[PDB]
From TrEMBL, chains A, D:
Keywords annotated in UniProt: Capsid protein, Virion
Pfam families the record matches: Gp10-like
GO-annotated cellular components: viral capsid, decoration
Region (Disordered) residue spans: 1-26
InterPro entries xrefs: Gp10-like (IPR049302)
Compositionally skewed regions (Polar residues) per UniProt: 1-11
Taxonomic superkingdom: Viruses
This protein's name: Major coat protein
Source organism: Salmonella phage epsilon15
From TrEMBL, chain B:
Domain of life: Viruses
Species per Swiss-Prot/TrEMBL record: Salmonella phage epsilon15
GO cellular component: a single term: viral capsid
Name assigned to this protein: Major capsid protein
Length: 111, 335, 56, 111
């Protein structure tokens, strides 16, 4: 749960930009209260870190942050204040793997 | 062979399930090939509109002795919520309103679709309810499996046995028993299945597109959503094993048998009082395996004349049910 | 900046026990991890104001 | 709001962190639902970033952390799984600033 937005595969591929994908999170609003989501599982190699961003449909401002280590299964949490467009995730970087999945908001818990 | 992957009811099918020399209904009826399952459980609405919150309690220390004056510090008690989500499933059904009347009596037709589709549905629900997820959600169950402790709270769940291999797929399943009253949740609107109803509008055709649309038909669907509830964990009791080969050595012998069942039984009760009953699950094969292995342990056992034992359906004498669990979880107890 | 190992119920408790969709209490109630024991004994008051003497 | 836990100030001087002092935020629990907070007023110059960590009673294990730049008044959000000790915050770093840190608990927001 659910479509709107995003899905795997993203998929960062070998070791790429992570801009993916398209359609859609829309650029006008403001938000400070509720939840988000991000996680996955099957990986292979090395260091990762995602991000967010926004402005007017393209470029190029703002972030929050996040960083992960080598495992197969993870997840952190939310944002706070945003302009409004919210591109991202913007993962990176080095080594390869492939098939490394993701999939980006919202709802969803564990335990 | 240019393209197209087709569905929907076609005259082909309705001509397969029909009869010659009449008949009215379909030769009562259509039988067979698919497993059948229990659970057969209880539902629950209520709270919040998602998740399920709940609480349990975290620690309860501590009192200290008084020396007729020395009293000093107060103490408190704390807790922490947990919860998880649910999920829903439903496709839909179609007929060609005309063909439903050719020959007449469509109610029996849609009844066949009803019982069959119901069978496949609940089959799916039993298949995925007992194995959790790293996927597009509902729900979670095996997540309580990995062994030892301190990395999680197994123990009373992971009594279990070891062996098999972790690098090759074979074969070793598992047996489960957990009490009810620890419900399964549904979002606040009607419950699983409930269908039922009907709608009769127009297509909406196949692929490209097909060349138009517009035609009246019968259409409807069965929806269903679920999500298990931990509520309180201690009712669950799980076992890893075997893989059937170690249970071949105990065919009647008593080295590595299944009597660790007893252990699992005595690993639950506090209480934790409730909720009314319990039940233990098998995968078929392991059921009968347990029977044949049990009738001949080197120990107690009387059995006048003759064997092979009044079914089993006991021990002790909590009824056992049979499930459609996979026959290969590899080891996956500790990687 | 806070200094102490929290005596008294900080808001963390009232927000974990919490109340959502209302309400009053926790669905009777919260449960779990404390072991169980018996005793379940017999009790007596003892002459005099303490002790109890006896002899053997 | 409120006493136990954190209080201002520290006051995050020139060249040091602010892991001090809270002993203890207690050592048994886990955390995933509700909110926190952090902000203060006058700064001086450039890049600052808080963090958090925990262990059993002392130090030292995993973290979460965040990043920000120079401005007056802010605030981000919450936390994911942790054991329990939360020595946070652990601010940084350079330039020359000598005033006021933050504190945590409920909103907050704006009007």
């Amino acid at each position: 749960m659910k479509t709107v937005n995003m899905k795997t595969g993203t998929d960062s591929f070998v070791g790429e930009d992570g801009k993916p994908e398209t359609k859609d999170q829309y650029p006008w609003g403001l938000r400070i209260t509720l939840d988000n989501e991000s996680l996955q599982r099957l990986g292979l190699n090395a260091k990762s870190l995602p991000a967010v961003g926004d402005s007017v449909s393209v470029m190029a401002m703002a972030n929050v942050c996040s960083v992960s280590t080598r495992t197969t299964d993870h997840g952190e949490d939310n944002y706070v204040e945003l302009q409004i467009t919210d591109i991202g995730l913007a993962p990176q970087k080095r080594d390869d793997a492939k098939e490394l999945k993701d999939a980006f908001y919202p709802d969803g818990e564990d335990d | 062979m240019a393209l197209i992957g087709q569905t929907l009811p076609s005259l082909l099918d309705i001509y397969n399930r029909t009869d010659k020399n009449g008949r009215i209904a379909r030769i009562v009826e259509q039988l067979a090939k698919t497993n059948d399952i229990l659970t057969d459980a209880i539902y629950v609405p209520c709270n919040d509109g998602s998740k399920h919150k709940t609480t349990i309690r975290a620690g309860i220390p501590e009192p200290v002795w008084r020396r007729y004056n020395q009293g000093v510090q107060p103490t408190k008690t704390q807790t922490v919520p947990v919860t998880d989500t649910t999920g829903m499933l439903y496709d839909l059904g179609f007929v060609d309103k005309a063909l439903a009347d050719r020959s007449n009596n469509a109610a029996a037709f849609r009844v066949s679709e009803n019982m069959g589709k119901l069978q496949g549905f609940n089959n799916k629900v039993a298949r995925y309810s007992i194995y959790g997820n790293t996927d597009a959600e509902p729900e979670a169950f095996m997540g309580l499996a990995p062994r030892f402790n301190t990395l999680s709270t197994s123990k009373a769940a992971s009594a279990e046995n070891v062996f098999s291999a972790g690098g090759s797929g074979s074969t070793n399943t598992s047996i489960w028993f957990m009490s009810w009253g620890e419900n399964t949740a549904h979002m606040i609107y009607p419950e699983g299945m409930v269908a039922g109803f009907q709608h009769e509008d127009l297509g909406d055709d196949l692929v490209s597109d097909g060349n138009g649309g517009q035609f009246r038909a019968y259409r409807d669907e069965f929806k269903w959503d679920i999500g298990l509830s931990v509520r309180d964990w201690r009712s669950i009791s799980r076992i890893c094993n075997i893989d059937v080969t170690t249970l071949t050595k105990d065919a009647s012998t008593g080295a590595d048998l299944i009597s660790m069942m007893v252990d699992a039984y005595y690993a639950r009760d506090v209480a934790m009082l409730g909720d009314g009953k319990e039940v233990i699950y098998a995968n078929k094969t392991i059921h009968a395996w347990l029977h044949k292995q049990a009738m001949n342990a080197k120990n107690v056992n009387l059995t006048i004349e003759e064997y092979g034992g009044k079914k089993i359906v006991s021990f002790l004498g909590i009824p056992i049910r049979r499930v459609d669990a996979i026959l290969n979880t590899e080891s996956a107890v500790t990687a």
